[PDB]
From Swiss-Prot, chain A:
Coiled-coil segments: none
Catalytic reaction equation(s): (2R)-3-phosphoglycerate + NAD(+) = 3-phosphooxypyruvate + NADH + H(+); (R)-2-hydroxyglutarate + NAD(+) = 2-oxoglutarate + NADH + H(+)
Organism: Saccharomyces cerevisiae (strain ATCC 204508 / S288c)
Keywords: Acetylation, Amino-acid biosynthesis, NAD, Oxidoreductase, Phosphoprotein, Serine biosynthesis
Gene encoding the protein: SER33
Lineage of producing organism: Eukaryota, Fungi, Dikarya, Ascomycota, Saccharomycotina
Listed name of the protein: D-3-phosphoglycerate dehydrogenase 2
Keyword Phosphoprotein: yes
Active site per UniProt: R237, E266, H297 (proton donor)
């Protein structure tokens, strides 16, 4: 049904990507160099020269200094959520598409919150520390059944919706405040003001992205705006909660418990003493506080999650390496074609990345005036632009000429022809 | 025309060891004098306060034995706001015609939700990881940390807690299988298993929801563990004897069981203490705490406000229904007897509540006495050496009720008699 | 648990006759407990009926039982109406002679609901009339006033067994459910109980009746009520043949006020199946009724499914077996509802007394005097009018004692029947 | 800051010709159009006169629009078939004049699904026969081989738009769902995809067809296959008039192998409604078929509901509005599917070119030279046959410059239709 291209390139994977990425690459038929740890600037630069696609994680640092030397690279796949460890503006300038999987931790974050809602309601965390050190304190005051309480979801997005149905299944009443009017799922209610959600809610979760409107969204003023004995959970971004204000609020018995998965300063390496007061001045005060579940950014750290993120991003790079499909790139125009589901043979695909200056399409379509262009799609994501064209009857003698003509043009950034 | 005055303060009820307020609402809305205490009272103060009380509501702390109930006259029923009839001398209470009630199934959702939470904590290892960040260590690990969706939960006891656990677990995206000595109509998408071993083979999480029986003691031992999937999880919030704790610590250290969560233990302390959960209680305490992914709780399954509130509602209505209509269904130590309230349309119908010794000829005695009026309904049953009779007699005259009461009170082998009108 | 073994041995032989084609599951239950069963496919005549009855009867509303045919019937224990209604059977006399009557009224609950669901869709899409048309060669493909069921509102009158089951089905199909009932009944699913019947009619597209036959319900949907529901709505009656004023409905349907209707019961129904039964001689409007668009007529088939009949067999056979073997009589129509625990193989030499008497004072004085020699563990009696029923479990009894006890009890004044279990 | 502003006239003109749902008028009027509505299909003469300046014409299954009657249309842009099929369109002609054709093929999913649930329940209970019987005066109250639908199993052949909706509804009524589809499709609810059609037929009590017309589906269910079904099961076909071997079926029902069946589509359906169209002349088997018991016949109405025409209106009007206003041609029957982002009004100096041309080399050389004076932000061209469609967004343009840009593009060789939108 669908034709492939050349198909014999070389990819380097750096920080332990799921084997499902490996199956997709190898079953696609590529050469794959796997590494278990994060490499230093020197060994990486030497290894990137003849590499074609690199799959990095949040630790490996890719900058213009180390990316200047990579001249045979096509696309960079971040098997991550975050993109800031890659110099997007430069990679766009050199015509390299970057891909990621931003919504892969959805079910993994929902299930975590549910467990943290129940554990905080029952103080299960405190109880396990207590029996571990030999103390047995069986109290039932302020221990609740989750059923019949109300859950306030802040940000009704990918994580927010999945959480909302689950909390309904557990028998909680769901309220969500969102800047956008979003069709509520199940029995939830869209609220008009944030104050109404906070006032009426027993549990409050944060599932918003990082914006200045969300920075310290819940601070000491915001905390007091809420139910008499309540709980707060933040598993979005380390700036949404005023942690000094929060430790103040928790010590005053205003918030019954809380569970946090993200902090303002997280360390970059696992260590036996990493989570100390040196990163956060308040760490000792929090640890000495009751019924708080502290976690090291594990919201999306599940086996099932990593397998899904691996498949998705590897499939994305595979489709971009084999077809021109760039949809989902962070720093690139989103461009795609029928990829020849009915097309016959002797058909070439032009993938022309250029600088977005007028007349570029004039030069190119003139170069192509000799053969029929069946489909064409070009879009511009800033200073760089991307063109795809399918020409209908080319011979190996002609394909050579077509490439050099395209290579000699002004504002060529990258040129490829798929056979 | 006839018509009778209100007696307030006629009944006097005593509630000990902090019974939930739903109980006081149920009692006061009916109108009683209720002496509430937040603690368990001393031997002197109790006997002083119990002589003329009419109904006592206690919990597992208050000890009511033959010595303290001997002096108590004009007592009607004892309400254990408990699961167990802990520290009540039932045989003596029955002997003096005292009904004891409790609410054994009020902790069902509170135990189910706990299990659901513990399944998630073990799968994500939230317990060990939250301890680590609390102690300054940072280990963000994702290997053998699973999403619950798509796994299977093996429920060992498909009773009140078992069924409730099942629907919740399916809602979370688990496949549920349950093994039970009884075939039980599956709820929802659950699957009844043929042998326990099939469950052990096929399950990723296994929970225990059985009672304490000789068949259940150390129900999960080393053969059972090896018959479970490589790296599965175990939860027991049923009874402290159901799991072979040494066998389990052996299996987990051998990396055959990934983690487990326990709410009940073989030797739990009888009083709260600052260093109570020590090795003196259980020889394995040091070995257990050392394992990597173990979630331990102090018999907290079901220690929730909603659980206690339901216990109050259930036991307070039960005692109220016994005091007002003689209805004893559900008593722990008593015959279970009950009759249709009354229709109110027919007047001058009295109801006899005759508690007697279970000896032949008594029913001859009573029905002769009642031979003057028509007995529309009658029901008597025997539970031990004691028996209980309730009857509705028709067209009785206020002059006659006193006579019928006096004749009945003078009978042989009557332990307590009461007439409603 | 328990063994729950106990076998009734006073006479030692009983023979029950299940006629008018009772479902085969009723035959299995009776035979498997061990009885003689005389099976008949039809309803018998008075002469053949009176004979064979001396040496349990199962009827099907067709069989006519009056005091006359039961006076001669001796050694009778219980009558099982494998019916919903126990009508044209003389309940009061059978009680007078101490004969318990049983039935199964809620076994057709799922069959009637599924019907209405079926009748809702077809009225909306006019499937019936369209099929008549194609059968005679006419082809009229019209889409006007044919609706999707999803999004409409169903007015359920009476929220009982059928009303309940119908409600979840109506929603699952995507209908909004509104229901009117004289009693406040906790809605199932998303349904809403309405205040006034007039409210229900006003907002409803389909109205079904699922109420019993009472003077309050007779012709309860008449010309005012039809004028109250929305223009073009639909009327369904599968409850009782008196609840709809057919003249009022037929007036409305001719006036294009009501789009269609489906009727499963009528004021005057035939007593036998026939080729020309449904005529004006049976019901004055019958000719005008049939000459109307989109009317679904059915011959009291609401409860006529194989599954319903099998369910009717299991229920009533189980009830008769329980009354015969343990005496549990709960659910009898004309009898006191009395029952006691199983008994047990463990408790040996424990007899059960089943004593039916006239509801007159002093019977228990007489009876309990007789039993004074042995201990009564449990005893229960209740009265359903002039007749009353007593159950007793006696301990430490021997067949030597049992004979005297039956002899003494059979000799009592105003005692009507005596039975022993062993 | 110049902010040049146009005039408002009655120039915008839309023509709706035969039986359009009221939702198109609302969508068109609320968008701000002049709409000429007609209740019937007009003759060639009246049509030609009315189409000359129509920006947009909407026809139905009746209206005949051909190249000859389309020659006169000059200011015409798109033809919207408020249909499932585009049979009377003459697509090649519309393409030649650069006219896009639209339709709504999947609107009838819930209407045909609901019909099936009703027809399943009606066959199970033999409602059609019973209602014919009472109308003809006969009263036959039979329950034998009449079933509750709950607990039986439904076999779905074709799990597409209709099959999927049907599966959920059938489960709601208490059925087990099995489906055979040539493509492995993710089952909905508790359904199971079965491997072979033969597996499906053996275990099923009800069989439904929801497949397209293919040589693989033509006479898909024939006599070998019917004999491969449960003894005394049911057959439903509301897909295509070619999928069932009607003689094979009539054989099986007369052989008491198939208890009943319901058909909505046939090999030879009339093109016009008639009082005698469906005679033996139309289908050789018609007389034998109609004489068979428990068969539900319907005249290709599985999608003839008000809700269906309302949904069709919303869909096709929305599609035409998008082509007129934004150029999005996705879903056209005879046209390339081309679309670009909605164009945030915030950038107020960008033109949109909708350039329809002949699919020959050098066109994009010619065009992008013309547009070379300004930056083309986005561009998208695709080709359907000999015609092609270009959309381009060119930046920082002034009303002064637009005249040239339109003039040059209108002046190009092999330009068939050009439109600029800002
Ligand atoms: N803990 C973890 O390890 C982990 C894992 C995955 C995602 N996350 C974080 O969780 C967050 C949610 O992820 P997602 O996939 O749900 O994103 P999302 O973009 O689908 O949803 C975010 C939602 O928040 C809403 N929103 C934004 N600002 C808001 C505000 N001020 N008030 C109310 N609503 C607001 C947006 O409208 C949007 O619907 C992101 O910040 C993501 O980085 C954390
Ligand atoms: N953790 C807590 O603090 C807490 C609170 C309340 C109840 N519980 C305990 O939980 C247990 C279950 O409570 P419940 O309400 O479900 O009781 P239950 O009587 O409702 O259910 C027990 C079930 O176990 C089944 N069963 C019996 N023996 C079995 C065996 N050997 N193997 C498997 N199944 C067997 C029975 O058939 C029954 O279905 C009890 O022991 C109860 O005291 C614990
Ligand atoms: N078509 C058949 O063959 C067939 C089969 C079975 C049952 N039925 C009939 O259907 C009817 C309903 O049966 P059911 O088992 O649900 O009975 P039901 O007793 O369970 O329910 C009847 C309900 O109607 C309500 N009601 C009574 N009078 C009312 C009034 N005036 N207005 C509104 N609501 C009123 C009652 O409160 C009750 O909830 C019965 O009459 C039954 O005989 C017909
Ligand atoms: N009765 C009516 O008036 C009416 C109305 C609308 C649609 N229909 C017809 O119903 C049919 C289904 O419509 P839809 O919207 O579901 O279409 P669809 O394309 O969504 O679904 C058709 C399904 O059939 C499957 N399939 C195709 N050929 C098959 C074969 N030989 N065997 C098994 N499976 C096969 C396809 O994979 C697909 O799942 C169409 O033919 C349509 O014309 C009839
Ligand atoms: O008491 P009595 O005899 O039953 O009336
Ligand atoms: O008298 P009695 O038998 O013991 O009850
Ligand atoms: O290439 P083309 O010119 O579009 O056809
Ligand atoms: O040529 P351009 O417009 O830049 O794409």
């Amino acid at each position: 049904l669908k034709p492939f291209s050349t198909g014999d390139m070389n990819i380097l994977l750096l920080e332990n990507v799921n084997a499902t990425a490996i199956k997709i690459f190898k079953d696609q038929g590529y050469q794959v160099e796997f590494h278990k740890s994060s490499l230093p600037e020197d060994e990486l630069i030497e290894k990137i020269k003849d590499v074609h696609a690199i799959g990095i994680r949040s630790k490996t640092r890719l900058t213009e200094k180390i990316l200047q030397h990579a001249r045979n690279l096509v696309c960079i796949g971040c098997f991550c959520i975050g993109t800031n460890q890659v110099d997007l503006k430069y990679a766009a300038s050199k015509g390299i598409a970057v891909f990621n999987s931003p919504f892969s931790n959805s079910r993994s974050v929902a299930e975590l919150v549910i467990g943290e809602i129940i554990s905080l309601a029952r103080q299960l965390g405190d109880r396990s520390i207590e029996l571990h050190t030999g103390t047995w304190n069986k109290v039932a005051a302020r221990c609740w059944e989750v059923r019949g309480k109300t859950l306030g979801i802040i940000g009704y997005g990918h994580i927010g919706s999945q959480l909302s149905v689950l909390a309904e299944a557990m028998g909680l009443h769901v309220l969500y405040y969102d800047i956008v009017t979003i069709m509520a799922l199940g029995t939830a209610r869209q609220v008009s003001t944030l104050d109404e959600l906070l006032n009426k809610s027993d549990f409050v979760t944060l599932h918003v992205p990082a914006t200045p409107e969300t920075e310290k969204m819940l601070s000491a003023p915001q905390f007091a705006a809420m139910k008499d004995g309540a709980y707060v959970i933040n598993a979005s971004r380390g700036t949404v909660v005023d942690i000094p204000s929060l430790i103040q609020a928790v010590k005053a018995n205003k918030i019954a418990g809380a569970a946090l998965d993200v902090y303002p300063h997280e360390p970059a390496k696992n260590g036996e003493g990493s989570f100390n007061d040196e990163l956060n001045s308040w760490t000792s005060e929090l640890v000495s506080l009751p019924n708080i579940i502290l976690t090291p950014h594990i919201g999306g750290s599940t086996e099932e999650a990593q397998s899904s993120i691996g498949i998705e991003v590897a499939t994305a790079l595979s489709k971009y390496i084999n077809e021109g499909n760039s949809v989902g790139s962070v720093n690139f125009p989103e461009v795609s074609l029928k990829s020849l589901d009915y097309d016959q043979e002797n058909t070439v695909r032009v993938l022309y990345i250029h600088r977005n200056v007028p007349g570029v399409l004039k030069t190119v379509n003139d170069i192509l005036s000799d053969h029929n262009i069946e489909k064409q799609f070009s879009d511009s994501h800033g200073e760089i632009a991307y063109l795809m064209a399918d020409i209908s009857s080319v011979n190996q003698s002609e394909i050579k000429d077509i490439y050099e003509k395209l290579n000699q043009t002004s504002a060529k950034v990258s040129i490829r022809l798929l056979y």
